[PDB]
Design a protein around this ligand. Structure first.
Ligand code: HEC
Ligand code: HEC
Ligand code: HEC
Ligand code: HEC
Ligand code: HEC
Ligand code: HEC
Ligand code: HEC
Ligand code: HEC
Ligand code: HEC
Ligand code: HEC
Ligand code: HEC
Ligand code: HEC
Ligand SMILES: [Fe+3]
Ligand SMILES: [Fe+3]
Ligand SMILES: [Fe+3]
Ligand SMILES: [Fe+3]
Ligand SMILES: [Fe+3]
Ligand SMILES: [Fe+3]
Ligand SMILES: [Fe+3]
Ligand SMILES: [Fe+3]
Ligand SMILES: [Zn+2]
Ligand SMILES: [Zn+2]
Ligand SMILES: [Zn+2]
Ligand SMILES: [Zn+2]
Ligand SMILES: [Zn+2]
Ligand SMILES: [Zn+2]
Ligand SMILES: [Zn+2]
Ligand SMILES: [Zn+2]
Ligand SMILES: [Zn+2]
Ligand SMILES: [Zn+2]
Ligand SMILES: [Zn+2]
Ligand SMILES: [Zn+2]
Ligand SMILES: [Zn+2]
Ligand SMILES: [Zn+2]
Ligand SMILES: [Zn+2]
Ligand SMILES: [Zn+2]
Ligand SMILES: [Zn+2]
Ligand SMILES: [Zn+2]
Ligand SMILES: [Zn+2]
Ligand SMILES: [Zn+2]
Ligand SMILES: [Zn+2]
Lengths: 106, 106, 106, 106, 106, 106, 106, 106, 106, 106, 106, 106
């Protein structure tokens, strides 16, 4: 998938996690987010099209997806423990990472 | 698995590699360690729970696991060539990476 | 596979990409390169055999493969969209990453 | 997935189909829509929650998804023949089926 | 399986759902029912053996199973959300569909 | 596959069923017919190209494939019971459905 | 799955074996009995709910199911040898093993 | 895998079951114990290395592990029934079987 | 498969193990013996064809094969530990178990 | 499948290749032909039923399928490169091999 | 497997086919022979060890196995049609091919 | 793959086999050669583009790949026996076949 739709997947599923009332819906939504974040790591955003592949901005862009992937995996562990409110709280914390990347590069 | 048990897997299997005679036992122990390290990369240790996900400490934490994961993979290559003594020597070298992370974050 | 043969896979398939006239062969070549680069990330090059695994040199070496893996995945996305000339141009741009590592560490 | 998110999948992927320039992305989008429509056939919409399951309203609701599923499969056949503009035109014609159900039951 | 035994599976597992405490047992019982209903859709009951395949009775027969299959799927969705009481209530509603078909064709 | 070749598959295999003298050849031929009928359900015949997707003719066209798929499944059950003459008789009865659709729409 | 329903599977499939007129229904019924018996082997019967898990009663219960499993497989063997009537006689013989455990723990 | 490490897996996972607060960690721990016990069943203990493989000692050792396997599965059954505290009590009960074999062969 | 030929597989592979000069042929031969013994366990020997399936004779026959299976696995264990000569000695030891059952039922 | 139906598969799919306007359908048709020709290599034609299996006639018959299989694989390579007209021309050249065998042995 | 044991498999299973009553036993025996013949095709017999790989003897050797492999496949077709006597007659015909090769190269 | 790259695969891997010091590297390299040789059998070399598909040159070309595939399979058997020097010697002998085809057709 392209970067735009990977963002649709992250956003759409993150909103279902907030609305959910059970661990299974949360785990399923987080699984879809994990695959979108894994795919997105390799993209180049439009604001960075002219930078070199080794620029600090592109290293910083990749670091943001590393952070996001790790936090999604940690939320998945909580959902697998049937700790639904804890997983939802971890999914909310994820938005700090979404926000930080958007501020600089979206 | 949670971080504690990933550390059980790392520590337990590293001891077997040191005492192993044949490459089949080193190979399976390394394979178990590889999976534990790939899982632990995504964790947040207790002492860093309140740091930001992009903090230099959490970045350094994840660097530790990249170094560990790469070193286990290199040791696994030697084990698949049936180079037991070389694989055990690569395993022994890993400990510097274990110790360095513990000193800072355990 | 060992580092040397991963470089064989990269070199051989990149030559085929330059000469291709259809998206299918570009895709197949890029997929092989992706797997070769994934594997090579964990290697330690000769010129670096006596540096520490956490050294700035080994960290930079892994950075080069991250950049390479990302660019290959982006080229693969172009090829899967049947944009043969554009994937070829992305493949040609890989050489800046190949040369930069080689100058430092080959 | 629930009815609401199946509609998300339909809406999101249909927008990507309109904007696509290659058969590959059209195919991938249609496949996701096919799975969403398959799943939604078994749902009961809000406006129909108090009708009998054998009611002419619920029978008509399922008829709409049968028609939708068939049209998506036909569009997918066009996309698999690499007829991008023709699959896009078949996708655009889906909207008559979307609107007709929505007018009655959304 | 023949139609008789599909009916065994439907009747037996519906009784378990009514008495079940946990969602795992409701989920597996519904899964068994779903497979039995999907199989029974293709059958011809004894009393309709000499009707034409397009007869209004055989069409009505297959409509009964479409209604049943959809209702089981909706109940299975609730069970996968761990909503035991709601799933059991959806299961209980199924019986109208069982009874309506039996009255006409058993 | 397209509608024409799905018809080749139905016709070719139905003739082998008549010639067969064992259950295995019959079951294999019926399995191929089932997949062709499943695929064909989504097509639009040339005589109906101008009708709307919800027209009664297109509903009637889909009903014919429903009937055919159900009868193929029933024949498959007999072949699986090693009831070869019974399965062949059921395959002959299938031609009433082929005929009825051809009369109106071929 | 729950012990009571595994018993249902054993009882019902024995009825079908007794009525069957072909090897493949007998084989399919014996296969389902075999799965049900292997799942039942891990259950605790209501009347042994307070014995300890290493009690002679729980070891004897599990042994009882292990012997049933061996006899089911031996009957399945005969059916694969195409000895339908011998397989049916063997299945009928199971009832002595069923009753033996029932006298003790049902 | 080597007998000593299978023992490690049994011991460590028992510690995690005792501390667990949710069914799924208990289930995951019991599943790993089950695999470790089935692999240990094929080992020869150091103190029986010179007995013959059909000796009463080796048959009793293998029987001992077969009984542990049955008790592990029975505990896993309870956990799948969502009886977390009962599954934990059952796991605690295993220690009598562990100690029984240890007295003889450890 | 038929009991007599499973015996062929046991006998022939024992001859190959005795002649082998490498672990992997020994492992491959022991694996085939293990499969043959597990398939033979479900057979009825000609001389027990009229005993009842719960007779002591049929339980003892099945028990006999269960013990052979355990000893084959224990030999396979040694071979995976790269103890080729010990695995060959263990395989040679099987003949006492072969002869024991033969005296009774061959 | 028998020889006759393999020839059906060859004939039917070769007609579709001639009429195709996209690489996808050519590829699918060639793949079916490949499997048909693979299967037919082992057949004995009627006109040769009384020759010896090592006869120059049967050897020549197999040579014809080797030549046919090779040409189909070469056509498939062209189709996988999206060279539709070139694969069609390779398919048309197959007919020299079809006719040459038919003249001798059909 | 080495050539000797492939010959064990051929000879052993051919004897079972001659004495078999049902098609299931002929079918599995033929399947075993087919795999043994496909493997033996690649071997070099002792008496030809010093001939060139393109020698007329090694070519004739491989022709023998092509004839054998084709004949086994034809016999397997008859067995899959449940034509036991015809399959056994095709198997018996194979022996000319066995004998012809042995006379020259055993 | 095309014939040129299949030759790269044969050549590249054959050189690694000579350098190897363990059976695993040799077996892995031989596995890649086997797949390349299987693919190459269907090609037409440039020097033979004008010959007919049944010409003696094209039969001779296919014979060369037959010989190569058989010898690769024999080398694989030795590598699987952990006979590393023997497998390497067999891989060297393979070059006679490479040479003979190149002399005539490259
Ligand atoms: C960088 C490391 C990012 C992270 C982490 C996340 N997003 Fe993002 N997002 C990023 C960019 C560069 C862009 C612009 C993409 C473009 O091609 O223009 C976006 C865009 C979005 C959007 C808008 C998509 C659209 O409809 O055009 C959304 C809704 C979005 N992003 C959501 C989102 C969420 C929820 C994230 C965390 C879970 C997240 N993004 C992370 C870069 C990055
Ligand atoms: C950071 C990058 C680490 C690396 C690399 C390794 N370990 Fe570790 N370990 C780390 C932390 C933060 C912790 C604390 C976990 C907690 O929740 O408190 C640990 C813990 C351990 C333990 C103790 C586990 C326990 O029972 O509490 C052990 C035995 C252990 N670690 C071993 C170990 C080994 C052998 C490593 C390299 C092979 C290794 N660790 C790497 C952080 C990190
Ligand atoms: C570091 C991040 C590298 C990147 C990116 C690429 N290569 Fe590389 N390459 C690297 C090293 C350290 C070495 C030396 C390995 C050794 O054993 O000394 C190489 C070597 C090569 C070779 C020579 C292989 C041989 O036969 O000896 C080639 C042909 C090669 N590299 C090609 C290549 C290409 C095409 C790359 C980009 C697509 C590329 N390399 C990236 C380190 C790194
Ligand atoms: C009946 C046969 C329908 C067909 C065909 C399509 N849709 Fe639908 N849609 C339907 C209902 C009953 C509803 C209401 C669901 C509810 O929970 O109230 C909807 C809703 C939507 C939405 C809104 C989703 C949301 O976020 O609330 C969208 C965006 C939507 N539908 C899009 C859509 C498209 C693109 C369709 C064709 C491709 C389509 N729908 C078909 C019923 C039916
Ligand atoms: C038509 C659309 C049906 C639906 C929906 C259900 N059943 Fe049914 N059932 C149907 C027929 C035509 C028959 C007769 C079968 C025969 O060959 O005579 C049955 C039979 C049963 C039985 C009796 C089975 C037996 O042992 O003979 C039972 C117990 C049964 N059906 C239960 C059942 C349940 C619980 C259903 C809904 C969940 C249900 N049936 C639906 C036709 C149809
Ligand atoms: C509608 C519900 C149909 C059913 C059921 C069957 N067929 Fe059909 N068939 C149908 C159409 C609309 C057409 C014309 C297709 C076109 O694109 O022109 C056909 C065509 C055939 C053909 C001719 C194919 C050709 O070579 O052009 C055959 C041989 C055929 N159909 C056979 C057939 C059989 C054997 C069926 C029952 C098993 C059957 N069809 C069902 C519509 C429908
Ligand atoms: C012990 C080793 C048993 C063997 C062998 C068989 N059964 Fe059983 N059965 C057993 C128990 C402990 C129970 C009680 C289950 C409970 O939850 O109370 C049963 C019960 C049954 C039932 C009744 C189920 C119900 O609806 O209440 C039936 C119909 C039954 N068992 C049948 C059955 C058959 C046919 C068996 C052999 C083929 C058989 N059982 C074996 C214990 C054991
Ligand atoms: C026989 C049937 C056994 C059962 C049941 C259990 N164990 Fe065991 N254990 C057994 C032996 C022969 C040995 C000696 C292994 C050796 O290589 O010397 C052991 C050893 C242990 C150990 C110590 C391992 C070590 O590090 O030296 C532990 C911690 C252990 N066993 C635990 C254990 C548990 C928790 C069990 C039940 C859950 C259990 N064992 C069962 C033989 C047998
Ligand atoms: C009982 C538990 C047995 C064990 C353990 C082994 N064998 Fe057996 N064997 C058994 C029976 C009942 C029979 C008679 C089979 C028949 O159909 O008549 C046999 C037979 C053999 C044969 C002869 C087969 C033949 O061609 O007639 C052989 C060569 C043989 N058995 C070998 C064998 C070996 C090597 C075993 C251990 C490794 C072994 N058997 C175990 C019963 C049992
Ligand atoms: C020998 C090497 C053959 C090659 C290459 C092809 N065919 Fe063939 N074909 C062959 C024989 C011996 C027969 C007779 C089979 C019989 O049972 O008598 C045939 C038959 C056909 C048929 C008629 C099938 C029927 O319905 O009776 C057709 C339509 C046919 N062959 C087509 C065909 C095509 C298109 C081929 C190349 C692509 C082809 N054959 C190759 C022997 C051989
Ligand atoms: C050449 C093309 C052969 C064909 C066809 C068959 N066999 Fe063979 N066989 C062949 C050789 C070169 C050898 C000698 C193997 C050695 O290393 O010495 C054999 C050997 C046998 C044996 C003896 C095996 C042993 O225990 O030493 C048997 C029992 C045997 N062959 C049987 C056999 C059968 C039944 C065949 C057709 C179905 C058959 N062989 C074909 C060469 C060839
Ligand atoms: C015919 C039966 C061949 C066999 C066996 C082998 N090769 Fe080959 N090779 C062959 C041809 C016709 C060609 C020319 C291909 C072309 O399209 O021009 C080749 C070419 C090579 C090359 C050069 C590839 C290149 O870079 O252009 C190499 C390195 C090569 N062949 C190696 C090789 C090896 C190592 C073989 C045995 C293991 C081998 N070939 C077999 C024809 C045939
Ligand atoms: Fe960094
Ligand atoms: Fe739960
Ligand atoms: Fe209708
Ligand atoms: Fe049969
Ligand atoms: Fe016992
Ligand atoms: Fe394409
Ligand atoms: Fe030849
Ligand atoms: Fe080894
Ligand atoms: Zn993507
Ligand atoms: Zn999107
Ligand atoms: Zn984990
Ligand atoms: Zn642990
Ligand atoms: Zn590697
Ligand atoms: Zn290489
Ligand atoms: Zn859903
Ligand atoms: Zn959604
Ligand atoms: Zn059925
Ligand atoms: Zn039943
Ligand atoms: Zn289709
Ligand atoms: Zn066709
Ligand atoms: Zn039940
Ligand atoms: Zn351990
Ligand atoms: Zn045999
Ligand atoms: Zn066939
Ligand atoms: Zn046909
Ligand atoms: Zn072999
Ligand atoms: Zn042998
Ligand atoms: Zn190829
Ligand atoms: Zn190449």
């Amino acid at each position: 998938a392209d970067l735009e739709h990977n963002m649709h997947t992250l956003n759409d599923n993150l909103k279902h996690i907030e609305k959910a009332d059970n661990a299974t819906t949360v785990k399923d939504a987080l699984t879809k987010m994990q695959a979108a974040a894994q795919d997105a790591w390799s993209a180049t955003p439009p604001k960075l099209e002219d930078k070199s592949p080794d620029s600090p901005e592109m290293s910083d862009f990749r670091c943001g997806f590393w952070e996001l992937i790790g936090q999604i995996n940690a939320a998945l562990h909580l959902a697998k423990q049937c700790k639904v409110k804890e997983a939802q709280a971890a999914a909310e914390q994820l938005k700090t990472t979404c926000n930080a990347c958007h501020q600089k590069y979206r």
